[PDB]
Design a protein around this ligand. Structure first.
Ligand SMILES: Cc1cc2nc3c(=O)[nH]c(=O)nc-3n(C[C@H](O)[C@H](O)[C@H](O)COP(=O)(O)OP(=O)(O)OC[C@H]3O[C@@H](n4cnc5c(N)ncnc54)[C@H](O)[C@@H]3O)c2cc1C
Lengths: 446, 445
């Protein structure tokens, strides 16, 4: 029988399992599946941990997610086309659910799919090697439950290990002398730790504004955002200052290209992440900056130097969960022989055409629309439930407008589901006052 | 032949120095390549502000923190081939700060001229033994070029340490605790805990000292809980000893006796695991931290593959002089100077050492054991013999001074066992010596 290795059981790994299960449910014969996951449970980023740095087994802590994290875009923009919010929750819910609520949702799909049986948890992928003599992959893993290292043979490999977990952490002059905490966004966990404190937020990557917003919400004395890029455009609260790039620090103070100086209690480097695959040699290893179109990926999924190796979710993310679905459905159909691949030259030429287009994008609206077009291209090739992508783009547009109107209240807005048409109700508590982040409090009418 | 040395900490440096000394005496030495993931040598001694993952996404290696001073008497770590009198040109106190000790460590290794063998910013990804060619393939990631390459080697000496990958147990309610939870490995600056109540869990390597640093730099209260036997130390007024932790909530810690207390931060001083992600089970050492790990002939030679070597993998009562003794021995085995017995005979010898290890109860017995182990290694090579029995006695003096007063043991002086020099009293008592710089230590203050 054909054997598939799925690396990671986050949203992308779960999507790959769901894809194969969906084909089987429709009556098709699917290959044997093995999914490796270093954590004790599925959900990837969405599986919260108090741990930072290295985990219970000495593996790098994967999740970058923090307490009180809520959906950053409308839930309506990440809804599964094959498993709606209506089906899972049985009632309408607001448009920006807390982490635990969205975790419950993504788990619900694969729980009902019955795919947990394919996953080996607490198992870290150590190496993937392609054997030219057999046309198969040797995947070496460390099972931390047995404390054993073993390897198995696989015909295809799908890498779903994410790219928002290995931090890019630049040093600034004086960091060794600084008296307060220095952490990366990746280590940020509890905004309460910074109550009545002055927090310096360095950079403009994914979590810069939200981490600042959490610190604000949970009672930080002052926030300072310093970054090299163009103004974020947002009207910050009274106790929140903006600065140009940080230059140096001392024992207590930060110094900027401004010439200005200020006392800071903690520094949070919101400087992003690197694509990091220590289990892969250079023949298979994706090397790219975070962007909408990394090269060497045919249809953004197929590794062009070895078309039996696949990557899911390695692009920067406006769309997320239903993008991973589109990708997983495509990867499944290629593996199952339903979508034969063109030549290596033909693959590269297609990938370059998408790259050329990527380089022309100049607005946020053009960016998510480009990703929408990419997803539309993927779903047209498979049996993934068709959904309204132009209407999803307009929801993103509305979300963008809401952030412009007020950066602290954008999460209080409601949107129409594009799968069911369900109009999300107003939440029972404004975001700024909703200090309890639990699933229980969110789903309760109070 | 070609040798791969994994890591350029004290152990990797010891292995390099072993070969260079053999060459200095007129012998023909194998080709040496040392792989080190950090930007410079020193291992633990290369302090960093960084925690968790480094600039390249590799686990941060050093566990060392600001204000760290020598653990025991410097006289007990003093190099058998390079004295403190040689390096500093003057007598200094018995417990030098990290920077001062590092100056001393780097002084010997710079003199040896072994830096040329080391490839820095380079992380070892995999080591695999090839049965067909009887050689090792070492796969490596050069972070300067961001390229992964492999090279062939005849022998491999693993010096990657065992105090860097933390054992981090979970307690009930950790998910909801409102304060910082960190491992000793993540501890950097005691000033972060000024005016705060700190809970220290466990009794591993840095438990006592981390609490002492927090105390010295202005922590409000300190609470210690552990599973091992109490030492009966005379802790300060704001230092509290409790039964072991069972539970936490949003801001309180709950203990076995039923008592509770508000805590601002929790530091898990719970030790480390032997973790070698670059090795498969054929070469991979599996052991708890102890004086005699199994499968290591003379504590060094991997018994399932005698061409693989481990340095410094034992628990460290002795440190630098042990790595030297081990490195000199590994060198002599690699060079064919010392023939190895059979696998069956190697394992029998290891069992005898293990059975002896299991009889040990007191600190004195454990020092003597490790001292005996080191003497055995030195007897087989040309490494200069040193006064082990008197070193044991100096260790026990230190232990006696810790029992007299845990906060002032660093103010005591001890006699050098290499030169006979009695260490002078430091110009500033430990509790008042807030500056940890080399400049402030060596000058008149
Ligand atoms: C702080 C933060 C907030 C975010 N907020 C949102 C949001 O609000 N809305 C949204 O749509 N998206 C958000 N995202 C984007 C996020 O990337 C996606 O939502 C989603 O989690 C991506 O899923 P994934 O499976 O591709 O990767 P991940 O979720 O990161 O999952 C990867 C999985 O692979 C496993 N793995 C990695 N290496 C190994 C190994 N060597 N061996 C075994 N297993 C391994 C990991 O344990 C993990 O389970 C956020 C991301 C971050 C970092």
């Amino acid at each position: 029988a054909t054997r598939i290795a799925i690396l990671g059981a986050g949203p992308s790994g779960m999507a790959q399992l769901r894809a194969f299960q969906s084909a089987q449910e429709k009556g098709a014969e699917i290959p044997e599946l093995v999914c490796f996951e270093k954590q004790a449970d599925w959900g990837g980023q969405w599986n919260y941990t108090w741990r930072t740095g290295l985990d219970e087994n000495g593996e790098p802590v994967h999740s970058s997610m923090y307490r009180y994290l809520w959906s950053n875009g409308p839930k309506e923009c990440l809804e599964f086309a094959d498993y709606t919010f209506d089906e899972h929750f049985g009632k309408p819910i607001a448009s920006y659910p807390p982490r635990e609520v969205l975790w419950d949702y993504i788990k619900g799909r694969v729980e009902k799919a019955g795919v947990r049986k394919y996953i080996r948890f607490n198992t870290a992928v150590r190496h993937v090697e392609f054997n030219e003599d057999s046309q198969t992959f040797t995947v070496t893993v460390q099972d931390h439950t047995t404390d054993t290292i073993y390897s198995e043979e696989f015909d295809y490999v799908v890498c779903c290990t994410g790219h928002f977990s290995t931090p890019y952490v630049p040093e600034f002059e004086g960091f060794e002398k600084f008296g307060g905490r220095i952490l990366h966004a990746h280590d940020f966990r509890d905004a309460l730790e910074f109550k009545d404190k002055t927090v310096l937020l360095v950079g403009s990557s994914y979590s810069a504004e939200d981490i600042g917003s959490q610190c604000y919400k949970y009672g930080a004395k002052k926030l300072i955002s310093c970054y090299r890029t163009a103004p974020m455009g947002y009207k910050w609260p009274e106790n929140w200052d903006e600065r140009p790039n940080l230059v140096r620090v001392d024992t207590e103070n930060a110094y900027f290209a401004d010439g200005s100086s200020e006392k800071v209690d903690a520094i949070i480097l919101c400087t992003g992440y690197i694509h990091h695959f220590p289990f892969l040699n250079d023949d298979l290893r994706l090397v790219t900056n975070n962007r909408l179109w990394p090269l060497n990926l045919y249809k953004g999924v197929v590794w062009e130097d070895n078309p039996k190796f696949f990557y899911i979710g390695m692009q920067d993310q406006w769309y997320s969960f239903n993008m991973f679905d589109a990708q997983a459905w495509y990867a499944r159909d290629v593996i199952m022989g339903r979508l034969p691949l063109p030549s290596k030259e033909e693959m590269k030429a297609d990938s370059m055409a998408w790259r050329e287009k990527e380089l022309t994008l100049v607005t946020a609206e053009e960016m998510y629309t480009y990703q929408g077009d990419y997803i539309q291209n993927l779903i047209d090739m498979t049996d993934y439930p068709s959904f309204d992508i132009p209407a999803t783009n307009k929801t993103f547009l509305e979300w963008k407008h809401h952030k412009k109107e007020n950066i602290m209240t954008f999460r209080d807005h409601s949107y129409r589901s594009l799968m069911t048409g369900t109009m999300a109700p107003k939440h029972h508590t404004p975001w700024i006052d909703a200090l309890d982040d639990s699933l229980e409090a969110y789903l309760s009418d109070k």
